[PDB]
Swiss-Prot record, chain A:
Gene name for this UniProt entry: csm2
Assigned protein family: Belongs to the CRISPR-associated Csm2 family.
Name recorded for this polypeptide: CRISPR system Cms protein Csm2
Superkingdom classification of source: Bacteria
Miscellaneous section: Encoded in a type III-A CRISPR locus.
Matching InterPro entries: CRISPR-assoc_prot_Csm2_III-A
The protein's assembly and partners: Part of the Csm effector complex that includes Cas10, Csm2, Csm3, Csm4 and Csm5.
GO biological process: defense response to virus
Keywords: Antiviral defense, RNA-binding
Its job: CRISPR (clustered regularly interspaced short palindromic repeat) is an adaptive immune system that provides protection against mobile genetic elements (viruses, transposable elements and conjugative plasmids). CRISPR clusters contain spacers, sequences complementary to antecedent mobile elements, and target invading nucleic acids. CRISPR clusters are transcribed and processed into CRISPR RNA (crRNA).
NCBIfam families in alphabetical order: cas_TM1810_Csm2
Molecular function GO labels: RNA binding
From Swiss-Prot, chain D:
Source taxonomy: Bacteria, Bacillati, Bacillota, Bacilli, Lactobacillales
Subunit annotation: Part of the Csm effector complex that includes Cas10, Csm2, Csm3, Csm4 and Csm5.
Function per UniProt: CRISPR (clustered regularly interspaced short palindromic repeat) is an adaptive immune system that provides protection against mobile genetic elements (viruses, transposable elements and conjugative plasmids). CRISPR clusters contain spacers, sequences complementary to antecedent mobile elements, and target invading nucleic acids. CRISPR clusters are transcribed and processed into CRISPR RNA (crRNA).
GO process terms (BP): defense response to virus
Single GO term (MF): endonuclease activity
Gene field: csm3
More about this protein: Encoded in a type III-A CRISPR locus.
The keyword Hydrolase belongs to this UniProt entry's keyword annotation: yes
Protein name: CRISPR system Cms endoribonuclease Csm3
Class of enzymatic activity (EC top level): hydrolase
Amino acid sequence: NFARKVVEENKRVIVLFNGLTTSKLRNLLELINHVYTKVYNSDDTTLSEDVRDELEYLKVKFAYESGREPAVRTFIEKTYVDKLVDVVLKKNTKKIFLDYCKYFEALVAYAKFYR
Amino acid sequence: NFARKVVEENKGLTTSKLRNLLELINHVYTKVYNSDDTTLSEDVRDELEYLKVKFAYESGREPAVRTFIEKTYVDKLVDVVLKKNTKKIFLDYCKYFEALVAYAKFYR
Amino acid sequence: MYSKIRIVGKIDVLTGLHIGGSPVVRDPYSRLPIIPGSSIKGKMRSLLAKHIGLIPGQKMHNQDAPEILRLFGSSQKGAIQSSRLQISDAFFSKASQEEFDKKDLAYTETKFENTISRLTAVANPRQIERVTRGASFDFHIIYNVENINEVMADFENIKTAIHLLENDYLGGGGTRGNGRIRFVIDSIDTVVGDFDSSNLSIK
Amino acid sequence: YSKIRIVGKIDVLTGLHIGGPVVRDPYSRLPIIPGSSIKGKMRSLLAKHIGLIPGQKMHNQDAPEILRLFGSSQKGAIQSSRLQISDAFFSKASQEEFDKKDLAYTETKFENTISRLTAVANPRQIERVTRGASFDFHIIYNVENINEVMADFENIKTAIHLLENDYLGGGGTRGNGRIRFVIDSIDTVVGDFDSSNL
Amino acid sequence: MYSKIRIVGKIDVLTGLHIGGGGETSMIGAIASPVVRDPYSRLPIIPGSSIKGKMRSLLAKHKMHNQDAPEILRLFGSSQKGAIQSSRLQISDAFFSKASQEEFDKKDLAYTETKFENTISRLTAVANPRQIERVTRGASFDFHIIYNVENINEVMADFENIKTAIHLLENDYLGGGGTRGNGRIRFVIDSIDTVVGDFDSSNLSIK
RNA sequence: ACGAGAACAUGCGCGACAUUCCGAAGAACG
RNA sequence: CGUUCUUCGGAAUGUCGCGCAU
């Protein structure tokens, strides 16, 4: 889908997203994995308040990691990850967040695949 | 919260002073971690009272710190933690301070 | 008159309990950790079989002592014995669920570990998911009274197995700290039959 | 088949660091010494005390005493472990001693990391348990050969003597984690084994 | 035989020793340079990290740390990828000795004293006050290090290097600053024994 | 007065063994 | 008074992966 297109567009000779690796993404992907587990536990059509706050914190973490790492900033701007966080936050639905997590999972999967 | 809009609108406030003030929040944060109470602790209350005293002297030390405090309403949020008397609200305030430090780093 | 003695209680994990399946085994409908009943049954059977004694050069689980084969079951050709013990899956208790919802605990922990290879003096990171220490699982076992005369010896063997299991661990990396558990028996009554189990106890 | 319990205390002579920010028991937020940390450190120290063959990549080719005590996974020679080290939790006595004083369970240590060729410091902030905090440790030993119980407890004593003089995790090289062992009672919790001489 | 040689001795500070540590202090006054203090007994301590780092840097003088000399790379350890080496020196925190604590309790001498300094620019001639917490000159710290005997032949050379390093630490400063004269230190040896193994350290000494 | 009638895909079996969150790192500068 | 304000590696690995009754 979109994830395959962006990973193919960002591939370079193998250099992905200006030198992005799984180790650089590991902190954020672990945070997003924590977010997912809380959503998996939740049984409510609407996102909780706590998950909304920590998704805002995930947005803050995206900004911080992008500021520290040029590769993560390139990944965020090319893959629209932060904007998608804002989109799911304003939509406030569990299924949309699960779709966004699926999108990130596809991103990392194809990144490893072309690695 | 609204850290992004304020930090973008206001973009000699140096990251050094922010990091010192963040360290003072860190010290209160360790205390609230040791507290482990839903209600606001009295020792934590003393910690945040001396924190606002330290906010005042900082303002006296550097005008740039004062502009940051008045524009970000950190002192007003401290008043909010007192007028609410909970630990969840304090943890929210600590995150907001951290967000201001992060956004400041990002826009820098 | 068929006699079934229901023994209900709790398993309090004195240390992190990791029954794999590194995700723990979870009940998909509730997505909460459980103790598989086969884990309790296998650990109890192994401990009690070692305590009673292992037939030298043993190969199968139908060669244990007749005490073990009666209570834990036998599938030997011709000599098939029904299993007295029916150890159900132990589900995460509601009380510990509330106590974990307070303090915002996750009901699980991801213990970080490593192994230092002798040749390289290098460490290989490893994450093991464990149930937190506070958790308690409500366990429910059923005893079938095939022989009324053997109930007392069987409950002595059950007590021995439980006592060994408390000083041992439930499934996981026990030798490295995981899996320590403690049984707290809440009730022992005959759900079915005229049997008088009021004089019985396993812990 | 008897089980003998070795319950006692571990008191930190210096700050104890075991990464996970020290690892804490989530239920009570108190720092703990993982049983795996003690087991690994004792096994490594004892295997160093006994000879080591030049190549032990498999981690299972080692002295037969080590394999008998701590367990083995060699295919066709799977030996069950007799030692079962368990997480040392924060002792209630030490908890109340720290609660009476205005003292935190952990501390933060600040270190410079001065890169000598560039003469620039890179500060780091470590959390480590303050000295004087005690963790109650609990071990179970399963006797399998009554003939080898004396040798196995000799090896356990040697390992504990090594560990008491060594560190337990963290920058022990920089001086974090030195501990002392105080064994209280060694009694056979299951079986007819006698533990008077242990 | 994995022999371990324990060295226990005293460290007496000839000048105020300042070793900083971040944190919060109740009723924190104008002073903003508090010396590192052991939380349990509220006494100044020297972190084994400081001693190890100072001795290693002095020995290296005499891009990364791992590129140093093999002797420095063996005593104090290594982390080169693939060629990871264990560390034979394990320096621990030198806590406040009971003898010095009693000597201070006699006369009620303060453990740590606050010193006033300033830096002035000639063009403006305006001073900036500074208050620094320095451990008083009479204090002594009991240090305890462990040398792991992994190679039998190299122990004598390692202890010669440690003795040189101990002399370098004495000659040079520790903690706050040499140009200021803060942190002068002296090392006296109480007992050097091979606590573990068949090794003997009757002739082995670090001074 | 149904190619029909009566007949548990059931019995036994621990997701387990080996595993150090560790290797190095001065709160330092004039 | 200011400076850096944690960073550099390893992130699981090896095995069993159905067997025994009808």
